[PDB]
């Protein structure tokens, strides 16, 4: 199948799937990828996570799977329909490119299934300190089905469960197919991070990856939705402001119970009793970017 | 166009969509078509009407659509995705044939959309007296999400709204591409009915459409799911038993309010105060079939 140069797309193409819990640097990540001349991710499709949830429910129900099987609507038919649907959306919702990419955060709960549908696809699982993601969703009011934004305790508990699943999926898929990317390390060290990422993806280095802010709205560049919640952050160069700002805004009882609330923090290397952890020191490149932002260049 | 004489499935494919409110003779209709060697419908896919409802849903919802459009997920992308999903399911869930067909009752709420997606598709809208359809779903407990089976009034109200939409959609699609098929006429006059239907479809006559019960479980024939609620009716030849079993079982208040609950009855030629309407005179063929059914063939 064909996108208008003549690019082919299909089942076996090397798709890139980016996700993680929302408020974890997923839009930044896909934006840096969009900045690459060979790659296009584009905006969150919304419809991909929706159809994945629908399909999951159909096989989850014993009776429903039985009815579908009796109808000739077997795993093999469903999987073929899913592949074709998902590819049309990924291929057609943005500009054509050699390498196609998708970012819808919670698709990474389905990375085992997606890797089966698309045997050459790879996954980037954004990992951010859950305290930072949770502070983000609460203060900006980014609504996520089932999360109670009036409660840090609830949001951290649900962050914890969500990343637990995505991280197990990532581990199941294996180090060849899924790479956890630490948001704080992306931000502090974007050159080295992107070097490792592009290498994992088998894609050649491009410097444009470090200049995504110059490629917003441009042909072959970074297409943004004006109504997605990360847009006003992503129009800036990689910068340091968002790393540790959550500190001191977590209710005292939740700080105390952090290790029980979010055991995934320790599992991922975030010390649950540090407020905050020392995430590290920034490359001069990011210090300079941050200074340009504060001067109001963007 | 992808693999399935080597037939190709693609959006310009000749396709038949059969539907109607459940309990309106849709399984009988599709089985009669299946009996034809050039056509395969097969079992209800269940999932096609769910993706259509998903598609149809947020076009009214201002916020979802605006978000999708800003993401580049426009009508054109969605339509391309829907076509691909639907073709995969229709093509791969049963045996190939020159003319593929799908029967999922509620797909006919989206015939205008389906006609646009599939420019060479045609539609058969099954119409049955709403009192017969409602009495069936209540007595057999055939569940429809949103229909309250503890109420004739509720079910009739929801039948009415459902068929109002499907009929309006059929009229908009137009005479060349959508044909209302009346269940009672189908049963009373199978030969005449199928002759008219097959003509509409541009498909030649075959006596096999009048002997669907002989082709059940056979190659090129009629594949039935044992879980589908109409299966034990459809194994029998076309017969007269189910035309007016509803008579006398409608609550009196509902009988009183019938034209107001179900104005679509009169609009479709069913007298809402005949209990039951004289649907017509049965062909000897169906009288004979009914007698064979009664003796217990």
């Amino acid at each position: 199948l064909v996108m208008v140069v003549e690019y082919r797309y299909g089942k076996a193409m090397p798709l890139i799937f980016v996700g993680g819990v929302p408020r974890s640097g997923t839009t930044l990540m896909r934006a840096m990828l969009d900045a690459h001349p060979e790659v296009r991710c584009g905006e969150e499709t919304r419809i991909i996570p929706r159809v994945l949830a629908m399909r999951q429910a159909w096989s989850k129900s014993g009776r429903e799977k039985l009815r579908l099987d009796e109808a000739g609507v077997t795993d093999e038919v469903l999987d073929a329909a899913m592949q074709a649907f998902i590819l049309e959306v990924i291929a057609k919702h943005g500009e054509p490119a050699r390498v196609l990419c998708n970012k819808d955060p919670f698709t990474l709960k389905s990375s085992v299934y997606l890797s089966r549908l698309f045997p050459n696809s790879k996954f980037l699982l954004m990992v951010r300190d859950g305290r930072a993601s949770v502070h983000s969703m609460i203060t900006r009011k980014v609504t996520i089905a089932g999360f109670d934004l009036s409660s840090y305790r609830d949001c951290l508990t649900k962050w914890n469960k969500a990343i637990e699943v995505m991280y197990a999926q990532c581990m199941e898929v294996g180090k060849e197919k899924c790479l956890p990317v630490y948001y704080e390390q992306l931000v502090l060290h974007p050159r080295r991070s992107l070097k490792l990422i592009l290498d994992f993806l088998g894609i050649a280095w491009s410097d444009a990856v470090l200049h995504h802010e110059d490629l917003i709205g441009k042909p072959g560049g970074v297409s943004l939705s004006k109504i997605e919640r990360s847009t006003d952050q992503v129009i800036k160069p990689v910068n340091l402001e968002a790393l540790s700002k959550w500190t001191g805004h977590i209710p005292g009882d939740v700080v105390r119970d952090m290790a029980q609330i979010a055991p995934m923090l320790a599992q991922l290397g975030y010390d649950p009793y540090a407020n905050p952890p020392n995430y590290g020191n920034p490359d001069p490149f990011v210090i300079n970017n941050t200074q340009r932002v504060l001067k109001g260049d963007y | 166009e992808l693999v399935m004489v080597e037939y190709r499935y693609g959006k310009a494919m000749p396709l038949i969509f059969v539907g109607g409110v459940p309990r309106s003779g849709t399984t009988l209709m599709r089985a009669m078509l299946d009996a034809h060697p050039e056509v395969r419908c097969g079992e209800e896919t269940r999932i096609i009407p769910r993706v259509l409802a998903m598609r149809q849903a947020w076009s009214k919802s201002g916020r979802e659509k605006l978000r999708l459009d800003e993401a580049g997920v426009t009508d054109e992308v969605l339509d391309a995705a829907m076509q691909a999903f639907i073709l995969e399911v229709i093509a791969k869930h049963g045996e190939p044939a020159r003319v593929l067909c799908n029967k999922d009752p509620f797909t006919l709420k989206s015939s205008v959309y389906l006609s646009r997606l599939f420019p060479n598709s045609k539609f058969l809208l099954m119409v049955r007296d709403g009192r017969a359809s409602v009495h069936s779903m209540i007595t057999r407990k055939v569940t429809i999400a949103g229909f309250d089976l503890s109420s004739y009034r509720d079910c009739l109200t929801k039948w009415n709204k459902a068929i109002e939409v499907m009929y309006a959609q059929c009229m908009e699609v137009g005479k060349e591409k959508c044909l209302p098929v009346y269940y009672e006429q189908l049963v009373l006059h199978p030969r005449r009915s199928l002759k008219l239907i097959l003509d509409f479809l541009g498909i030649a006559w075959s006596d096999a459409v009048l002997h669907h019960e002989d082709l059940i479980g056979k190659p090129g024939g009629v594949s039935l799911s044992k879980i589908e609620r109409s299966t034990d009716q459809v194994i029998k030849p076309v017969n007269l038993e189910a035309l007016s079993k509803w008579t006398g079982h409608i609550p009196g208040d509902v009988v009183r309010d019938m034209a107001q609950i179900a104005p679509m009855l009169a609009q479709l030629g069913y007298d809402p105060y005949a209990n039951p309407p004289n649907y017509g005179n049965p062909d000897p063929f169906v009288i004979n079939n009914t007698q064979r059914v009664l003796k217990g063939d």
């Binding site: 129900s61 429903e64 | 009407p49 769910r50 849903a57 009752p105 709420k109 569940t143 429809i144 999400a145």
Partner: peptide, 9 residues
């Protein structure tokens, strides 16, 4: 049941 015999909107 998780799913009814039929549904749409």
């Amino acid at each position: 049941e998780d799913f009814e015999d039929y549904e749409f909107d």
